[PDB]
Amino acid sequence: APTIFSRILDKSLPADILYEDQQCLVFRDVAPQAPVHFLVIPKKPIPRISQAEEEDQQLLGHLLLVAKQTAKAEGLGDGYRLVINDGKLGAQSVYHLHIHVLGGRQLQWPPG
Amino acid sequence: KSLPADILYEDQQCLVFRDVAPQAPVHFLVIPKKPIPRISQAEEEDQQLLGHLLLVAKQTAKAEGLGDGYRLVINDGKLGAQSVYHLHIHVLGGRQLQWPPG
Ligand code: NA
Numbered sequence: 309a310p311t312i313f314s315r316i317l318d319k320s321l322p323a324d325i326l327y328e329d330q331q332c333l334v335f336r337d338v339a340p341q342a343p344v345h346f347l348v349i350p351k352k353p354i355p356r357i358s359q360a361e362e363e364d365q366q367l368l369g370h371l372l373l374v375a376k377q378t379a380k381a382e383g384l385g386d387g388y389r390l391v392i393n394d395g396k397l398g399a400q401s402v403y404h405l406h407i408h409v410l411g412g413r414q415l416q417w418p419p420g
Numbered sequence: 421k422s423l424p425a426d427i428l429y430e431d432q433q434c435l436v437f438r439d440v441a442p443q444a445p446v447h448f449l450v451i452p453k454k455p456i457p458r459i460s461q462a463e464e465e466d467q468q469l470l471g472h473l474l475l476v477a478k479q480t481a482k483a484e485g486l487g488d489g490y491r492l493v494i495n496d497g498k499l500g501a502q503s504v505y506h507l508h509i510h511v512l513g514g515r516q517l518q519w520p521p522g
Contacts, residue, residue, distance in 0.1 A: 369471035387497025395489025418443035
């Protein structure tokens with residue numbers, strides 16, 4: 309059961325790719341919820357953060373470092389929010405691990 | 421009346437404690453013991469620690485009974501609504517989270 313992210317990864321679905329390496333891919337959200345809204349995904353198709361395991365420690369740290377690097381590259385110096393959704397109550401849309409990065413507006417509280 | 425503080429988890433690398441102004445029936449906070457003021461100021465040397473914090477977040481979520489789903493949130497700076505200038509991972513569960521996430 310590959311998710312739609314398999315098409316972003318294999319480039320069969322065009323996307324605005326901000327960053328790519330052997331471990332991960334970064335691309336703009338199809339439906340931005342802020343002036344800047346992008347996703348950091350692992351190439352390893354970890355379905356959800358609840359299903360990450362000890363072996364994924366280095367990859368998970370790499371995803372946060374790529375998120376904060378890309379946030380700087382996208383001019384989010386006045387701040388931003390990183391979001392990971394798990395499961396139904398999380399509103400997880402796609403069952404491939406992704407970090408949302410939202411900036412360029414005041415994010416409110418609570419976070420949904 | 422702010423709720424009583426409570427540590428859910430502690431190891432050599434981190435502390436997990438309840439949010440005393442919770443925004444969900446389950447709402448806790450994952451912090452490194454290492455002084456990292458904000459995620460934008462993490463550096464390459466923090467890679468293992470940052471993955472450790474996400475694994476602790478997921479593990480604590482399971483211990484708190486968040487099997488139906490939950491949300492992890494990291495705020496950076498004023499536009500992120502970052503309230504304390506120390507790295508915090510917010511974990512929220514026990515209700516439907518909405519979209520957008522603020
Ligand atoms: Na201690």
